[PDB]
Amino acid sequence: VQLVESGGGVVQPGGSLRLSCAASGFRFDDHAMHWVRQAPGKGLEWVSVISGDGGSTYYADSVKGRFSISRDDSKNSLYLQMNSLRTEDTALYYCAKDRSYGPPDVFNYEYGMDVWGQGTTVTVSSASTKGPSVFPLAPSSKSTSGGTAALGCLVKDYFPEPVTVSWNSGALTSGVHTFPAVLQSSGLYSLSSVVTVPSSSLGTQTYICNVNHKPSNTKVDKKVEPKS
Amino acid sequence: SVLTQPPSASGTPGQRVTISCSGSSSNIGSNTVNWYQQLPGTAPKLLIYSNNQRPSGVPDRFSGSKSGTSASLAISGLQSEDEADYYCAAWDDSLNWVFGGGTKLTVLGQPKAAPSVTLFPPSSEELQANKATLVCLISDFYPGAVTVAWKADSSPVKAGVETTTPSKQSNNKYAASSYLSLTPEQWKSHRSYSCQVTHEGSTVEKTVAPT
Amino acid sequence: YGFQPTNGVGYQPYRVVVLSFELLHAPATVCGPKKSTNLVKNKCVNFNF
Amino acid sequence: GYFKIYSKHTPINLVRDLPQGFSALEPLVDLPIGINITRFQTLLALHRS
Numbered sequence: 224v225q226l227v228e229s230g231g232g233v234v235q236p237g238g239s240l241r242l243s244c245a246a247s248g249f250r251f252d253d254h255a256m257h258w259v260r261q262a263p264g265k266g267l268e269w270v271s272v273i274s275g276d277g278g279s280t281y282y283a284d285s286v287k288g289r290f291s292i293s294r295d296d297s298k299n300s301l302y303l304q305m306n307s308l309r310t311e312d313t314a315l316y317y318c319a320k321d322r323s324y325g326p327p328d329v330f331n332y333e334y335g336m337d338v339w340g341q342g343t344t345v346t347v348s349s350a351s352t353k354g355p356s357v358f359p360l361a362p363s364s365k366s367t368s369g370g371t372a373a374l375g376c377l378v379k380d381y382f383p384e385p386v387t388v389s390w391n392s393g394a395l396t397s398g399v400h401t402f403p404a405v406l407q408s409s410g411l412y413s414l415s416s417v418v419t420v421p422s423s424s425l426g427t428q429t430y431i432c433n434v435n436h437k438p439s440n441t442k443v444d445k446k447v448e449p450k451s
Numbered sequence: 452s453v454l455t456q457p458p459s460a461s462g463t464p465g466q467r468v469t470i471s472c473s474g475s476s477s478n479i480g481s482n483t484v485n486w487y488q489q490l491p492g493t494a495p496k497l498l499i500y501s502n503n504q505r506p507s508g509v510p511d512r513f514s515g516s517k518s519g520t521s522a523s524l525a526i527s528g529l530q531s532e533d534e535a536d537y538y539c540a541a542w543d544d545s546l547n548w549v550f551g552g553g554t555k556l557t558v559l560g561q562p563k564a565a566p567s568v569t570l571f572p573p574s575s576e577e578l579q580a581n582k583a584t585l586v587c588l589i590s591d592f593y594p595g596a597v598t599v600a601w602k603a604d605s606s607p608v609k610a611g612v613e614t615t616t617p618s619k620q621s622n623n624k625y626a627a628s629s630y631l632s633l634t635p636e637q638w639k640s641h642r643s644y645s646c647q648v649t650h651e652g653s654t655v656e657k658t659v660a661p662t
Numbered sequence: 663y664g665f666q667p668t669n670g671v672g673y674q675p676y677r678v679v680v681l682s683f684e685l686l687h688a689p690a691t692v693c694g695p696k697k698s699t700n701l702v703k704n705k706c707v708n709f710n711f
Numbered sequence: 712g713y714f715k716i717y718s719k720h721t722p723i724n725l726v727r728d729l730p731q732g733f734s735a736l737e738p739l740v741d742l743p744i745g746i747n748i749t750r751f752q753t754l755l756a757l758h759r760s
């Protein structure tokens with residue numbers, strides 16, 4: 224009764240992709256299937272449906288002609304072939320199961336979409352890939368207040384979205400808070416992770432942010448110390 | 452083919468809250484509605500199909516009504532786990548499934564917290580890197596309607612700033628961040644900058660001066 | 663049709679009812695269930711009985 | 712297309728002769744048939760016992 228997907232990633236505008244979705248726990252000749260995309264932070268948007276029992280497909284109007292969709296009940300899979308993408312297709316893509324097949328066109332009054340997948344991220348652009356630039360944001364009296372003071376690391380200007388910053392190789396879990404990355408007009412991401420620590424302990428112990436960029440192979444440790 | 456619905460609804464925990472949708476004639480006229488709940492981060496759930504039929508696993512607090520060309524979810528008594536998006540669906544003879552606009556929920560329970568603000572100037576290595584970025588962090592401000600304004604020595608600025616949307620933490624309050632882009636010569640040009648945040652009329656501002 | 667309960671949908675029995683209406687010349691037949699508000703008194707009112 | 716029927720049941724104090732008097736007949740039925748009519752008959756219960 225599970226739905227998994229695969230096939231996402233980063234392509235430049237003009238490329239092509241092949242998304243796939245594998246199901247488990249039922250037969251495919253009793254259910255229709257849906258591909259539903261969703262831009263990050265926004266509402267849903269239906270993309271396509273295929274009926275059970277062979278083929279009667281439909282696409283949304285903005286995606287007409289560019290896409291194609293098939294199923295395979297020999298392998299229990301869905302394929303969604305995407306050709307000639309544009310920059311407004313950066314989204315999560317969800318593989319949803321429609322109980323009681325037949326396009327909602329003929330089997331009205333009861334369609335639903337009961338079980339859902341976990342989605343797959345796809346983004347497009349020419350910005351390509353780039354490594355992060357790191358600075359330490361020092362603990363300061365303007366950040367200090369009474370018993371505690373905050374220090375952190377600013378990791379900026381990178382395209383390949385999944386990036387991680389830890390504190391002291393994963394040691395400090397108190398006060399460590401990485402904020403959501405921000406997407407600049409330049410097209411590159413940026414973020415800053417900060418942690419508070421007793422003001423008696425400004426420079427005393429080790430506070431080294433471990434920056435790892437997994438699409439690239441960047442690994443750098445930066446120490447944060449009070450301002451000179 | 453638009454399925455107009457309100458963007459956000461509200462209510463105290465423990466009473467009936469309705470959620471409407473309005474489609475024309477191919478949407479809700481000759482078709483049926485579904486309702487989908489989207490908790491933050493997860494996959495969407497199914498709530499109501501065929502205008503009033505909850506499937507197995509949906510508790511008996513949700514109902515469903517379809518009257519002519521409008522539809523309505525009706526949550527009977529809010530709780531601490533129903534703070535989510537809710538979408539209505541249709542089919543539209545136009546030959547395309549249509550979706551709602553979504554509606555958040557605002558249990559409005561947690562008292563009013565104070566947005567803790569923290570501001571950082573561009574570090575030294577960044578100064579040597581021929582660039583400059585101001586960093587304004589906001590945290591712990593449970594009602595999430597924060598906004599930000601940036602200040603050079605006396606004037607407001609509106610260029611080179613990026614602002615995160617508020618994000619929920621573990622303690623179920625919010626956090627946000629904003630960045631200011633500057634060339635170091637502009638960094639030393641003005642004697643000081645500041646980040647101000649406004650929240651429920653109230654305002655708190657931080658300020659830093661170059662060295 | 664061989665209607666076996668171990669069949670997938672696509673060979674399963676569906677029951678079908680088709681309606682059709684006609685308005686030839688006849689005096690009166692099946693209509694709808696007209697509504698009916700309430701009756702007030704002692705006020706100049708606009709009524710339909 | 713409506714076949715209207717008025718009727719009245721008065722008690723005579725005779726057995727089978729047409730009396731004299733005044734008695735107005737009240738409507739009974741209304742049938743939206745559409746039927747054409749040009750002739751009619753009567754029905755009687757025979758003598759067998």
Ligand SMILES: *[C@@H]1O[C@H](CO)[C@@H](O)[C@H](O)[C@H]1NC(C)=O
Nearest residue numbers: 687712744745746747748749
């Ligand atoms: C009754 O008979 C007449 C014969 O002149 C015919 O013209 C008429 O159509 C008949 N009535 C109906 C309702 O058809």
